[PDB]
Design an enzyme around this catalytic site. Structure first.
Site, PDB file in Angstrom:
ATOM      1  CE1 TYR A 120     -37.482  90.121  73.017  1.00 34.45           C
ATOM      2  CE2 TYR A 120     -36.822  92.425  73.365  1.00 34.45           C
ATOM      3  CZ  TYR A 120     -36.588  91.164  72.806  1.00 34.45           C
ATOM      4  OH  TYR A 120     -35.483  90.895  72.068  1.00 34.45           O
ATOM      5  CG  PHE A 396     -28.805  90.495  81.725  1.00 29.84           C
ATOM      6  CD1 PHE A 396     -29.545  89.744  80.831  1.00 29.84           C
ATOM      7  CD2 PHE A 396     -29.404  90.887  82.909  1.00 29.84           C
ATOM      8  CE1 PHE A 396     -30.862  89.397  81.121  1.00 29.84           C
ATOM      9  CE2 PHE A 396     -30.722  90.549  83.175  1.00 29.84           C
ATOM     10  CZ  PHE A 396     -31.454  89.831  82.264  1.00 29.84           C
TER      11      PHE A 396
HETATM   12 CL1  LIG Z   1     -22.065  85.650  74.110  1.00 25.75          CL
HETATM   13  C1  LIG Z   1     -22.926  86.886  74.973  1.00 25.75           C
HETATM   14  C2  LIG Z   1     -24.001  86.561  75.790  1.00 25.75           C
HETATM   15  C3  LIG Z   1     -24.670  87.589  76.441  1.00 25.75           C
HETATM   16  C4  LIG Z   1     -24.254  88.903  76.293  1.00 25.75           C
HETATM   17  C5  LIG Z   1     -23.177  89.198  75.478  1.00 25.75           C
HETATM   18  C6  LIG Z   1     -22.687  90.607  75.334  1.00 25.75           C
HETATM   19  O1  LIG Z   1     -23.694  91.457  74.778  1.00 25.75           O
HETATM   20  C7  LIG Z   1     -23.352  92.781  74.564  1.00 25.75           C
HETATM   21  C8  LIG Z   1     -22.060  93.269  74.810  1.00 25.75           C
HETATM   22  C9  LIG Z   1     -21.792  94.610  74.610  1.00 25.75           C
HETATM   23  C10 LIG Z   1     -22.795  95.446  74.158  1.00 25.75           C
HETATM   24  C11 LIG Z   1     -24.078  94.969  73.915  1.00 25.75           C
HETATM   25  C12 LIG Z   1     -24.386  93.621  74.101  1.00 25.75           C
HETATM   26  C13 LIG Z   1     -25.782  93.080  73.882  1.00 25.75           C
HETATM   27  N1  LIG Z   1     -26.809  93.780  74.672  1.00 25.75           N
HETATM   28  C14 LIG Z   1     -26.948  93.327  76.062  1.00 25.75           C
HETATM   29  C15 LIG Z   1     -25.775  93.656  76.972  1.00 25.75           C
HETATM   30  C16 LIG Z   1     -25.491  94.966  77.371  1.00 25.75           C
HETATM   31  C17 LIG Z   1     -24.425  95.211  78.217  1.00 25.75           C
HETATM   32  N2  LIG Z   1     -23.620  94.246  78.672  1.00 25.75           N
HETATM   33  C18 LIG Z   1     -23.900  92.989  78.296  1.00 25.75           C
HETATM   34  C19 LIG Z   1     -24.955  92.645  77.475  1.00 25.75           C
HETATM   35  C20 LIG Z   1     -22.510  88.183  74.818  1.00 25.75           C
END
Ligand SMILES: Clc1cccc(COc2ccccc2CNCc2ccncc2)c1
Ligand SMILES: Clc1cccc(COc2ccccc2CNCc2ccncc2)c1
Ligand SMILES: Clc1cccc(COc2ccccc2CNCc2ccncc2)c1
Ligand SMILES: Clc1cccc(COc2ccccc2CNCc2ccncc2)c1
Lengths: 396, 396, 396, 396
Positions: A120, A396
């Site tokens: 990045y 996130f």
């Molecule tokens: Cl529509 C949408 C938008 C933004 C984030 C997400 C969820 O994305 C994930 C969920 C579980 C595991 C991994 C990810 C993606 N890696 C970032 C992250 C890590 C932990 N918690 C949330 C996001 C869905």
């Protein structure tokens, strides 16, 4: 290969690419809560033609910066290229489109958590917070005579079930995130997710417990395999007394050999103990990454250290303009100029300076930021430092 | 149980206690060189009656502090209590006698390297430098476009045999130790020892090589057992160009998977790479510990940050006096007062502040230093910070 | 394939087979000292024809058995079959010839240390002592209020160089070996060997230290690779006070995390600590093996427990005769009979009972010794028990 | 901070403290079965004020002691102090109240399983049984020619599903627990629990199988992660033939490399094999702990060895009275006296002697029990020994 905002019909393709790209992504329910934070036009997909071979989006966040200033922040997330479609410029095209939308929408900063450290920087993101894992061998741990909350009589800390004290956690976190650079507003749907992950999982994580003080909480759970390790998932303390009281309670987990937490480099824990070495740094990594989208809006928004006297310079960001920068009385004015640059740096370097996690002098010694004035470097170091140590909110 | 300066007859008893106390102590030759740094009256022994059951001494050192000021420093070392004579107050009695001699002799500071983190705080020593081990997976390491010394044409660095370039190493080290807080003057006898340890040992360490630049050197050797690990024992660079050129050469060790070094938290290495995460923090520990022997002489001796405006306060050290402290124009005046204290702290805490390795705000949050003024805390943090990051010279 | 007493010309062939058979056998010097304990006619070799393909010998030893009785003992050692000559009955032929010589010479018992547990039972050897490794996490270890030698004032224990106190070690060991079943007389040449192994080895073992009390000693050395482990090679204490004083000193090795020793199942160490669990059993194995060569001479020689009233039975050893056995007033009479056996067992089982390391009831439950009288079993258990716990002297 | 018998309203607070204190405690169902064994007034809680910060209770048990005598036994369990409330004397206050209730109710002994070895000695509990883990490398294991059940023709052992043979297991266990010191009556609700744990768990334990003989059973399951290890959770054999037949069947688990069991030090298994060393002691720990509540009732209740002739002495238990103790014909009379003590020991030491797991001579050598008569020591050792080796029933 088209690049488009996705329609409702694209989301099953996006959940498949997600499941294949991220081991944490269980299925569609994994995306529900986060997805309420994505604005209209917050997402791009790349289609072959058609199937989803690339995706990226941003969430609407609120990020606390030095001076307790809260910025609207575009949180990049759900970034994935199909393993069939590597080396085709898909990440570059997706980041260029989202950055155009984020800038046009008026966000002064974008932010993300990086899967790898090498990706990045070239898109202008600099690592801006530092994750520091401390592991305490709690069998040896004794509190220093100076440590708060050593007195006889009732404990101020209670052991509680997380799901029964949601309001107290929400209120404490809200106070924390407004006073600490790195703080992020946590919406109700993310508290719903956090409290769901606190239950035991069939062949998964063990049940989470909470330690609750009027001015802080810790959430912790025993490790699934190492039954003598307790992992603190989150500790939010608004006062030093709350921080010390919570650590007294964690060191009272007499079943455990070790307590681990992912904290920040300035965590005072080691200083609470008669042996500072018992708080072992077991892991260090970049946390939040920042891309400054509008240099003057970002530089004028944050507060600066009052201890440095008024100074003026000329800062050039490599593809981000040249500015007359005046810093005094903890505030900065940053206006267009064609005067000769006194300081130059790529956009990513400014993001690394912005919350005070990295010193200008350190970046200068790697030649990431260039100036012929060593006095100007000391002044920048002092001015960009954060009074309140920068912490990492939630990924996130 | 008498406590005495040792006679020549005591030294075989001291070498036996040494061999049994320290795994590095091979035999009498292990002590020869260091012993030339011990002044007359620098050593105490405790006898049962008689055999040696306790020993401690100090060496005459020169320690660089912020402002490039060099202090005479008493280096405590060779501290041992026989395993037969634990819990009899022998360490306390030996430290009280040496501290009396060190103070009477006019040393403003004492220093040591601690075998454990829980022992020396109660005798007024605070951890004052931080050892930070970086391990680089050099197979992925690529230098940032900004990194110095990327140009085509001759390398400024040479691969050499350490014993054939003693003069160049001595001259570079002498320049380094005078400009960096933590620097120690290294006497000829310690260069004799260092160059002896650079040879291969029958069933011991592998042969050491050197990388030599006009303005820096690195000494490194392959690990005895992990044949894909090169350990840098020492890298001294006087310029950023020398630091980057030496790391380009170390990352050219194409036989190795990993390069490790014990460095300081502000090492710019990570910033030289396109992936900052490749420079993994694998270990962190206290380095040099300081005991301020004379509070006013020490506080007036070191330089302070010019970026903080003149301020006055009243500092009380718990058994070390109360002082009117005025800091302005990078200098401090520290005079006796009975006026009310605005800041209090134990002696060990002042040693931890003294070289800029620990922030006053961090110690305040652990209640190790107490004040009711948050402005005064920010001013102390700024004033005690070191422009040049504190490093650790060599252990003793 | 001849079986012969070796001539001087056979010994280089025997040292080659030794070097290839035993990782401890460095070369001829490895055999010099032990070889002074081999009598004329103590050794057999097997030649192909000619080269040495098999060897075995016995040493003249003195073994202490219950009642402080010392027996002449044939110590089998240096037993090896060439890897070219497996499964040709060479071990059986060599053991049959040595056993014939040992019996004709008048030894009542033979003894050995087994490389494997499955070999020597069929030749009539039973495991007769038990090695028990204790590892103490000495960082938690605190002595019970009841433990001897807790008083203030001088330690009775001194830290010394082994080679400078040979006479004290010899005298203490001589007192120990005469009072403990399992004790072996240690000849001067074996003290020469032991004191040679106490020096540091280039890329080998670390230097050994001694803890010396008037009535006991411990020899210990730090582990070559695990620098937080001290291994006690030998602790000989003649009084409980000496045993406790030596353990107080070993637990005073503040550099170490762990102290390990190979001791016996009845070592009182765990009971000296407030937490008995800190003395962890980390390894258990057969030590000395015994073959009773003359059943009546051996059974009449040792003392029996005075607490069991006079009883008579008839014991049959599977190829070793049937005997009227009368045990009373701590002594036993064992005379030829053709009366019906009340107890039967193979020769190896009697060796396992002989020093009190194994209960008759335990062997009966495995059907290794058979009787239809449960009262007779309880009487044998009580009578064969040793007042003084059986220990292992030194391997050979 | 009140200490009270809990009301129904206290039990959710107790299940929360339980879940946070014990990794095995899943939730309220974890307590249901055990809770039917807690009498009215069997439980205490400590409240802050109010929330539960401490708890402890006892169950009504029946413990078999030497002579096949069954004592009513108070089994202390569910003992927890909140991590917020350490070092406030809560465990001491809870144990003093339960011990008062247990003594007033007429129990002659209390018992427990200790989470740590350093806690319960000071409350008068001595470790009274020894857990001994044997690991067999079953690929090498061959039964000795002497071992029972080697004959051709049908096996006496069947492989069965545990839940289909509950009655046979119950009847065999009932016979076992009445004949072995350490035996505990197992109530129907604990058989309900055991048979529930025999099913496979989603991401948990694998399915349990049983080997069933008329006079013994083994319950075993493959390890969740090490698929070549079978763990025997329980083997109860009433005859030597049943013990050998069950081990023949376990060594027939040709899929496995290793069979592990937690057994007792006198398990005859090693003696059943041609190589005794294949039964490796891989772990040893205290099992059941005993506190003698009424010294004379306990000493008169158990049987003593018939092989020691009548003797009389005077025993003082440190805070537990002085008694004229006469032992003859396997029975003991224990009456009040003010005559001079010949033997002294703390209450915990008597609990360690009581089932025959620890010898008086071993405790004397640690000075845990003091006497000036070595004949009296030999007599106590012999008299307190158990004919039938002490075993551990089930933890609670
Ligand atoms: Cl529509 C949408 C938008 C933004 C984030 C997400 C969820 O994305 C994930 C969920 C579980 C595991 C991994 C990810 C993606 N890696 C970032 C992250 C890590 C932990 N918690 C949330 C996001 C869905
Ligand atoms: Cl007379 C004398 C004075 C001061 C120091 C010494 C040498 O002391 C040691 C030598 C080898 C190993 C360990 C020690 C003691 N620990 C400190 C130390 C570590 C490394 N190098 C030098 C000192 C002898
Ligand atoms: Cl001529 C002779 C007779 C008896 C013994 C020996 C020496 O034998 C060895 C020496 C070194 C290593 C191994 C062995 C043989 N294994 C037994 C042993 C182990 C330790 N110490 C002494 C003997 C030589
Ligand atoms: Cl109301 C009640 C009384 C007594 C015991 C219990 C249950 O207690 C536990 C249950 C599961 C795990 C741990 C514990 C507490 N440690 C002892 C124990 C271990 C195994 N099985 C039973 C008890 C509940």
């Amino acid at each position: 290969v088209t690049l488009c905002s996705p329609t409702e019909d694209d989301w099953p393709g996006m959940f498949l690419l997600a499941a294949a790209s991220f081991t944490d992504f269980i299925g569609p329910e994994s995306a529900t809560a986060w997805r309420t934070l994505v604005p209209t036009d917050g997402a791009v997909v790349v289609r072959d033609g058609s199937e989803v071979v690339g995706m990226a989006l941003y969430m609407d966040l609120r990020l606390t910066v030095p001076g307790e200033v809260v910025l609207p922040t575009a949180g990049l997330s759900f970034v994935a290229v199909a393993p069939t479609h590597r080396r085709r410029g898909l990440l570059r095209a997706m980041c260029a489109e989202l950055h155009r939308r984020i800038a046009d929408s008026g966000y002064p900063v974008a932010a993300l958590h990086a899967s790898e450290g090498g990706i990045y920087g070239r898109f202008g993101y600099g690592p801006a917070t530092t994750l520091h894992e401390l592991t305490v061998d709690r069998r040896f741990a004794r509190f220093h005579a100076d440590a708060p909350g050593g007195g006889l009589g009732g404990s101020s800390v209670r052991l509680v079930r997380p799901t029964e004290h949601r309001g107290e956690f929400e209120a404490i976190y809200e106070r924390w995130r407004q006073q600490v650079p790195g703080g992020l507003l946590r919406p109700q749907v993310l508290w719903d997710e956090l409290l769901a992950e606190a239950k035991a999982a069939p062949g998964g994580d063990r049940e989470s417990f909470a330690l609750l003080h009027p001015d802080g909480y810790a959430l912790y759970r025993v490790d699934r395999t190492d039954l003598k390790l307790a992992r603190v998932s989150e500790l939010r303390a608004v006062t030093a007394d709350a921080h010390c009281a919570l650590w007294r309670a964690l060191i009272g987990l007499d079943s455990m050999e070790r307590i681990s937490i992912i904290t920040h480099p300035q965590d005072p824990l080691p200083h609470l103990l008669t042996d500072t070495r018992l708080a072992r740094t077991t892991w260090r990594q970049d946390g939040l990454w920042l891309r400054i989208m509008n240099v003057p809006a970002a530089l004028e928004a944050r507060g600066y250290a009052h201890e440095v006297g008024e100074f003026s310079t000329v800062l050039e960001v490599s593809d981000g303009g040249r500015f007359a920068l005046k810093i005094g009385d903890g505030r900065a004015r940053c206006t267009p100029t064609d005067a000769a640059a006194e300081i130059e740096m790529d956009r990513d370097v400014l993001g690394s300076l912005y919350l005070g996690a990295h010193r200008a002098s350190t970046l200068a010694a790697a030649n990431r930021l260039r100036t012929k004035d060593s006095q100007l470097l000391r002044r920048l170091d002092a001015a960009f430092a954060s009074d309140v140590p920068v912490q990492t909110a939630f990924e996130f």
